[PDB]
Structures are given as C-alpha cells and as structure tokens.
Design a protein around this nucleic acid. Structure first.
Ligand SMILES: NCCCC#Cc1cn([C@H]2C[C@H](O)[C@@H](COP(=O)(O)OP(=O)(O)OP(=O)(O)O)O2)c(=O)[nH]c1=O
Ligand SMILES: [Cl-]
Ligand SMILES: [Mg+2]
Ligand SMILES: [Mg+2]
Ligand SMILES: [Mg+2]
Ligand SMILES: [Mg+2]
Ligand SMILES: [Mg+2]
Ligand SMILES: [Mg+2]
Ligand SMILES: [Mg+2]
Ligand SMILES: [Mg+2]
Length: 539
DNA sequence: GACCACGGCGCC
DNA sequence: AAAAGGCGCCGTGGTC
C-alpha cells in the first residue's frame, strides 16, 4: 500500500503493536491505519490515538481498552476476529485467522492495519447470506466488544492488606500439614511433585493404585483417587488438605495482590470474546471467572473482592439456566411444567442425595446436586456417579434412568441434534451460533461418543451464553444512565458496582432486564444479591 | 529468562 | 479415574 501521512480518514482500519498482550499493562509501541490503498503510520502512537473515531480492525477491543486507560473514549468497531469466530469458533487467534482468510500476522503495525482491512473484506463477504450469523455480529458480538472494553478498563477493587494477612496464616497451616505428611512418609520430599508423591503412596506405603493418567499413564494421585483412599492411610487426608491450601495460596492469595494496577488501584482482567467452542466468554490475565467459593478458605478469598467506598456490589445469577434453556430447546412438557410451577431441580436432587426434606437442603448440598444434575445430563457414567455418591453402582444406574424417564423429550432432542450434526457437520444454538463437530462420524466409538457429548451440549450451553451476551448489551446503556458499573461476567452471572443510594434500584432494573431479555417457553428467573463484597453479594 | 506438556484443580 | 460439557493457571520436569 502507498504510504501516507497520519492521520487516516474516517473508516480506516487500525494496526498496532503492544509490548505485552494485556492492554491495561501494555506500552503502545506502534500504531498505523489503512484505507483506500493507503497506509498511515503514526509517529507518536499515544498522541495519534486522539485522531481516531473508533478502533476498527483485528483485536479492536485491546486498543480500545488501552485508549480508555489513557482517558480517551475510543470505542471498538468492526473486528475480523469476531466475523471469523462466528463462522467457525475454532478461529480463535489472529495467527490462525490471517493464514485462513488471506494474509499473515506479523509484528509490524502497518502490515497489521493492511491485514485487518483485507481480512474484513473477505470475511464480510463470507457472512453474506448467513443472516443469523450476521444478526449475532451486529446485534450481539460487535456491541458487546464495546461493553467488554469498558469492563476491562474499569477493573475491580481488592482488599490487598487482608489477602497479605491471609497468606501468613495459610503459610503456617501449610507448614503444619507438610510436616505431618513427611512424618507419615518417614522422610521429606517435594510434596508439590505428583511424581514424587506417586512413589511415596504406591511404592513406599503400599497403597493400591486406582487410576492412570491420560497422556503418560502414571498412577494418578488426583483428588478422585485420594478420596477413594481416604480410609486406607492417614497420610491421604493430610495430602488432600495440603492440596486445597496450596492451590488457593499459589493461584489466588499470593499472585492477585501483585496485580493491582498502579493508576486505578484495581484488578483488571481480560474478557476474551473468541476463545471458546460454545460462545461463552473466557477471562484471563488473571482469570476472574474462577475465584474460589466452595470451601471456607475459598470464601475468605472471595471476600477480598470488594465494592469501592460508598458503593455496593450487585450480583445477579440466572436460576437453573441451562435446564430452562433445555426445556425450551427440547419442548419437553414435563420439564417446562417443572419451571412453570416454580420448582428447583437442584434442590430436589439434593434432597434425594442427602436423604433429607427439600427444606433441609443447605447451599453446599444444592451445589453438590448441581454437579450431579448437569453431570448426568451431559452423559456421566453410572460408575463415576456411584463413586462420587458412595452409593452402589446399581443405585447410580437407577437415578440416571429416572432422570431421563422423567423428561422424555430430552433424549429425543439429543438424538435429533446429533443426527442433524452428522448431516450438516455442525450444531447450533437457538440464535444460530455454530460449532463444527466432524468427529460425529468418527469410526472409533470412544472418539465418536466424546464428540456426541460435546455436540449436544453446545446448543444448550451456547444458547445460555447468547442470552447473557444479549442481556449485557441491553443492560449496559441503562447502567451508564444510572451511574452504575458493570464489572464482571461469570457465565450466567453478572457483578455490578452501584452507588449505595441507588444499589437497590440498580439491582431491580438489572434483574428485570436479564429476565426479560428473550422470553422462552419457560420463565427466566434471576437471583440477585447486594453486598460490600462478592461473597456477601451472593446472598 | 522463556516455552512446553502434563497432571491437577479452581470456577461455571 | 470412571462416557459430563466449557474454561485458565498452578508447579513440576523438561528443553532451549
Ligand atoms: N459444579 C460446581 C458447582 C457450580 C457449577 C456448575 C456447573 C454449571 N454448569 C452450567 C450449567 C448451569 O446452568 C450454568 C450456570 O451454572 P450455575 O449458575 O452455577 O448453575 P445454575 O444457574 O444451573 O443454578 P443456580 O444458578 O444456582 O440456580 O453452567 C455445568 O454445565 N456444569 C457445572 O458443574
Ligand atoms: Cl466443578
Ligand atoms: Mg485460530
Ligand atoms: Mg445460575
Ligand atoms: Mg432495557
Ligand atoms: Mg452462576
Ligand atoms: Mg425461540
Ligand atoms: Mg491441560
Ligand atoms: Mg468436570
Ligand atoms: Mg508434575
């Protein structure tokens, strides 16, 4: 392309190079733009940003977040990555997308600008006639990228001092556990090494091996294996506790306080829009979609996520969402009726599991039942089921039989979905998001059946994903108008931050928007909590 | 120093 | 571990 002076005309595609992948932490090393057979290279990248009306091109959101960081209201526009992702969600990297749709991802801004331009042209052409994918792009993905940019640049507050204090207490407990483990082993070793631990458990103490690892076929020391061996030797329970504590310390307690951004004094994640096979978002650098909540220490960590002073967190979470979605997709009367009657399948399963009335079910019981309900729905084996429930194999089988016998049309929907997946080569969500699954026609049964579970899950999980995205796009402008902030999405949950005086009003509005987003054959219900911290917000 | 596969595990 | 699906990050062992 003919080189030309900065700035570019309106509608130009941008290319840019960052010192690191995370836009909140990156230095903008170079910036260029391409349009109408011209390439414009910016002599001063930061200053040049103010000349742009929007960020249009590959990874548009990243440039937008950096702009927002610098106090510039630069929104993201067209991004070929989003087009490619909609065509085929295995399109997840600019490297792959460039190669596939007409170019090469290099480390030069001008070349990236030019690449963005021609990729958009090509990919736009491919989405012609694809009216549903086009709808998703214009009505969901493109606007959502703006929403996500603001969320990333906003960040969330973290009680750093608290976490620092927590680290020392956890360190002392870890020392206590490991010392005990070493005594029981008769000698010290690296307890963080599963290879060393395998030798101690199965060769030195005698313990019977139960399972093997996938790629290298070592004797597994996973929690599932250790659970089965809890009553075989005292060292086992000690290892399980050590694992729990060290996992939380190494992954959350220690890293997170070090990631507070110096300017904002908050913690900033990345919400990746083209990262999953089903249409879910992912979160990275750091991942804020897997903050602990199940165990006591886990809850203490979640409490470190706090509202700004004078503000409150609002947490909203769709109730039994994939089950409701399944009701709609399958059209099963029995399942639809369950939700019309305001029933809770997680609580009911829980009451059965622990053998107590539905009123006796506590949160941890219900949560346990959640794993069981979705586990069974998406093809869990009776053997695994029996093992995790410590009930005979025969009982496990029976629960799985009643589960489906309760809801006749679910299996019917599955069969139809798989048949159609085999025919077209892909499956799709309610809104037409696609996932290609060639292995539905695999000649190896284990490979084929794995593919089948992926395939019939995707329309359900993906539809739920689409609904949340649509809800975020509708909700965002309403929140702006109320002076509230959208902070995090956790799959079927949103976390907002609102001034205390308005927090209740914001909660009510957000709930109604989420419930009214796209009516199904069953009501959508959203549970909402308000609190000074994320854990308190979830009640 | 950086990458990698792996086993493992946090969340949904 | 086992016929749940979907993610990203940890330390280890290893290479470069
Ligand atoms: N398993 C740990 C407990 C939390 C969980 C979960 C899981 C959630 N999911 C999917 C199905 C579920 O509808 C969706 C959102 O999860 P979540 O909000 O925790 O469950 P759901 O909304 O069904 O129940 P509630 O929100 O508690 O009413 O994510 C699974 O497929 N497997 C799961 O294990
Ligand atoms: Cl889980
Ligand atoms: Mg790719
Ligand atoms: Mg939910
Ligand atoms: Mg609205
Ligand atoms: Mg949830
Ligand atoms: Mg419909
Ligand atoms: Mg892995
Ligand atoms: Mg699982
Ligand atoms: Mg290892």
């Amino acid at each position: 392309l003919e080189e030309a002076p900065w700035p570019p005309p309106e509608g130009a595609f941008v290319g840019f190079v960052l010192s690191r992948k995370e836009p909140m932490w990156a230095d903008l090393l170079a910036l260029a733009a391409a349009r109408g057979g011209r390439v414009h290279r910016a002599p001063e990248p930061y200053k040049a940003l103010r000349d742009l009306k929007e960020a249009r091109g590959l990874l548009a959101k990243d440039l937008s977040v950096l702009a927002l960081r610098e106090g510039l209201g630069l929104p993201p526009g067209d991004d070929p990555m989003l087009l490619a992702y909609l065509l085929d969600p295995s399109n997840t990297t600019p490297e792959g997308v460039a190669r596939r749709y007409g170019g090469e991802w290099t480390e030069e801004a001008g070349e990236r600008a030019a690449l963005s331009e021609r990729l958009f042209a090509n990919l736009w052409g491919r989405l012609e006639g694809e009216e549903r994918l086009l709808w998703l792009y214009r009505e969901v993905e493109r606007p959502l990228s703006a929403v996500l940019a603001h969320m990333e640049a906003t960040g969330v507050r973290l009680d750093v001092a608290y976490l620092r204090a927590l680290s020392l207490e956890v360190a002392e407990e870890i020392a206590r556990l490991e010392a005990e483990v070493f005594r029981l082993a008769g000698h010290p070793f690296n307890l963080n090494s599963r290879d060393q631990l395998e030798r101690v458990l199965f060769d030195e103490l005698g313990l019977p091996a139960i399972g093997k690892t996938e790629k290298t076929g070592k004797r597994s020391t996973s929690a599932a294996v250790l659970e089965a061996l809890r009553e075989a030797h005292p060292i086992v329970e000690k290892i399980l506790q050590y694992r729990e504590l060290t996992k939380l310390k190494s992954t959350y307690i220690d890293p997170l306080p070090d990631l507070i951004h110096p300017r904002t004094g908050r913690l900033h994640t990345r919400f990746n829009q083209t990262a999953t096979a089903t249409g879910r978002l992912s979160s990275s650098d750091p991942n804020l979609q897997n903050i602990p909540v199940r165990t006591p220490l886990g809850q203490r960590i979640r409490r470190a996520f706090i509202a700004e002073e004078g503000w409150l967190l609002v947490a909203l979470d769709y109730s039994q969402i994939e089950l409701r979605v399944l009701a709609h997709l399958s059209g099963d009367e029995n399942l639809i009726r369950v939700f019309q009657e305001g029933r809770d399948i997680h609580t009911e399963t829980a009451s059965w599991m622990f053998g107590v009335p539905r009123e006796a079910v506590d949160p941890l019981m219900r949560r346990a039942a959640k794993t069981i309900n979705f586990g069974v729905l998406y093809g869990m084996s009776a053997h695994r089921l029996s093992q995790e429930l410590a009930i005979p194999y025969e009982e496990a089988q029976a629960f799985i039989e009643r589960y489906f016998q309760s809801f006749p049309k679910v299996r019917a929907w599955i069969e139809k979905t798989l048949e159609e997946g085999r025919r077209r080569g892909y499956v799709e969500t309610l809104f037409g998001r696609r996932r290609y699954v060639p292995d539905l026609e695999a000649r190896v049964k284990s490979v084929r059946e794995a593919a089948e579970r992926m395939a019939f899950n995707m329309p359900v999980q993906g539809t739920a994903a689409d609904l949340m995205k649509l809800a975020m796009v509708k909700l965002f402008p309403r929140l702006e108008e109320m002076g509230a902030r959208m902070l995090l999405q956790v799959h079927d949950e949103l976390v907002l931050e609102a001034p205390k005086e308005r927090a209740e009003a914001v909660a009510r509005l957000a709930k109604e928007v989420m419930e009214g987003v796209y009516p199904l054959a069953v009501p959508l219900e959203v549970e909402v909590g308000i609190g000074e911290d994320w854990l308190s917000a979830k009640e």
